[PDB]
Amino acid sequence: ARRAVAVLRGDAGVSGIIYFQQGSGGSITTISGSVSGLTPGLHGFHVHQYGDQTNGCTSAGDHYNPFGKTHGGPNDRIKHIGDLGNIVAGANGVAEVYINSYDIKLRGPLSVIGHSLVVHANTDDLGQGTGNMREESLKTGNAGSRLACGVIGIAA
Amino acid sequence: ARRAVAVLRGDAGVSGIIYFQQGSGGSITTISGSVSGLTPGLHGFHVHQYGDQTNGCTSAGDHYNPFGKTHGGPNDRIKHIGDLGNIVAGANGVAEVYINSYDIKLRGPLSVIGHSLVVHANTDDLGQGTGNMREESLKTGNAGSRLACGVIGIAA
Ligand SMILES: [Cl-]
Ligand SMILES: [Cl-]
Ligand SMILES: [Cu+2]
Ligand SMILES: [Cu+2]
Ligand SMILES: [Zn+2]
Ligand SMILES: [Zn+2]
C-alpha cells in the first residue's frame, strides 16, 4: 500500500492538492482531490517527465511516456502512462478530481513519484485531433499552457 | 546515470536549488547547488520522510531513515540515510553546497526521489548532543525550525 500527493501551484491563480493511493497488491491507483481557480470547463491533466521546477512548470518536460507511445486518453490501450485526460471545473472554478487507474503506479520502475503533475489551460483532445492539429494532438493533446504543477511526493 | 533536483522554498526568505547526480554504476551521488537568504553560519540539511507540502515543510515528517538508526552526521556509519549534516552560509547569506555520498541514491528502493529536502534554522549537532539535549539530538540533531524545503524530483 502506498500514498503520494502533489500540491499544485503556479502563476495563473490555479492551485490544488491531489492525492494518489495505490492498494496493497498494487493493481489500482485512485487519484483524487481538487483544483481551484480554473476557468469553467475541461482542463488537460497529465503526469510529465520531470519533477523539475527550476523553470516553473516548463521544466517538467513532456508527458511521462516510458513505453514510447503516442498521446491518448486515460482509457486508451495506446497512450502515455501520464495521460489522465481532462478534469472538469465548475462555474465556481473548482474541479473535483476522481480517477481510478491500472496504469498509474506508486511503486516500481514506472512509479509516478518524483514526476510532476500538471494542469493545463485548455481541453486535452485525447489524441483525437485531425488535420493540421493531429501532430500536436498525438504529442500533447493540444491542451495549451501549463497553469499549475507540483512534484508527486511520498505521503504518509 | 541519474539526475534529480529540489527547489527549496518557504516562509523565511530562504530559497535555493539543489541538484543530485548519481554516476553510472550508482556508487556515488554528488549533491550540489546553493541556498540564499540564510543567517550566516551552519544550517542543518536533511532528506525527510515525506514529499508532502500540504502543511508547508511540517508535513515532510521526520528524517528519512529506512534502516531505523539514530541520527548522526553524513560521515557516520550509524545515521539516518537522509542525514546530510550542515551547510555553511557566508556573510552574504548564501551557502554553496557540495556533498559526495555513498548512501544517497537516486535509484532503487532507497531512492531519495519523492522525499523532501529541508534546510533548518540552526546547527545540526550530528547526534553529539549531551545531557538533556541528547534525546532530541539522536532524533533530529536539534537543528530547529524548517526554513525551506522542496520535493526531490527527477531531472533531465
Ligand atoms: Cl489493488
Ligand atoms: Cl558511481
Ligand atoms: Cu501536459
Ligand atoms: Cu530536518
Ligand atoms: Zn500524453
Ligand atoms: Zn537524522
Q: What are phi and psi of A138, to 5 degrees?
A: -80, -5
Q: How far apart are CA A62 and CA A44, in angstroms?
A: 13
| Residue ranges with strand state E in A1-156 | 2-8, 15-22, 29-36, 41-48, 54-57, 83-89, 95-101, 116-120, 146-151, 153-155
Residues from chain A contacting residue B155 (CB–CB below 8 Å): 50-52
Dihedral sign for Cα atoms in the order B148, B86, B79, B6: positive
Residues A117/A152, Cβ–Cβ less than 8 Å:
yes
Placement of cell 516548463 in the chain:
A58
Domain spans in chain A, listed from the N-terminal domain onward: 1-156
Ligand 5 centroid to residue A68 C-alpha, Å? 10
B80 is in an annotated binding site: yes
Residues from chain B contacting residue A17 (CB–CB below 8 Å): 54
Residues B32/B18, Cβ–Cβ less than 8 Å:
yes
Q: How many CB atoms lie within 10 A of CB A27?
A: 9
Ligand 6 centroid to residue A29 C-alpha, Å? 31
Q: How far apart are CA B26 and CA B73, in angstroms?
A: 22
Distance, C-alpha A49 to centroid of its chain: 11
Residues A43/A121, Cβ–Cβ less than 8 Å:
yes
Q: How far apart are CA A18 and CA A7, in angstroms?
A: 7
Paired sense of beta strands A95-101 and A116-120, if any: unpaired
Paired sense of beta strands B15-22 and B41-48, if any: unpaired
Are residues A7 and B53, on separate chains, in Cβ contact within 8 Å?
A: yes
B115 is in an annotated binding site: no
User: Phi-psi bin for B83: left (phi > 0), alpha (psi -120 to 50), beta?
Assistant: beta
Strand order in the sheet with A29-36: A146-151, A116-120, A41-48, A83-89, A95-101, A29-36, A15-22, A2-8, A153-155
> Which distant-in-sequence residues (6+ apart) come within 8 Å of A132 by Cβ?
none
Q: Is A139 helix (H, G, I), strand (E, B) or coil?
A: helix
What resolution, expressed in A, was reported for this entry?
Answer: 1.5
Whether A80 is catalytic is yes
Are residues A53 and B150, on separate chains, in Cβ contact within 8 Å?
A: yes
CA neighbor of A59 nearest in space, from A97, A116, A123: A116
Measured from the alpha carbon of residue B147, the closest ligand is 4
Experimental method: X-ray
Residues A6/A34, Cβ–Cβ less than 8 Å:
no
Ligand 3 centroid to residue A43 C-alpha, Å? 10
B46 is in an annotated binding site: yes
Distance, C-alpha A13 to centroid of its chain: 18
Q: How far is A151 from chain B (nearest CA, A)?
A: 6
Residues from chain B contacting residue A61 (CB–CB below 8 Å): 156
Q: How far apart are CA A73 and CA A51, in angstroms?
A: 22
Residues A127/A76, Cβ–Cβ less than 8 Å:
yes
CA distances from B124 to A15, B10, B11, B37, B44 (A): 34, 19, 20, 18, 5
Q: How far apart are CA A37 and CA B55, in angstroms?
A: 20
Measured from the alpha carbon of residue A74, the closest ligand is 5
Q: How far is A31 from chain B (nearest CA, A)?
A: 15
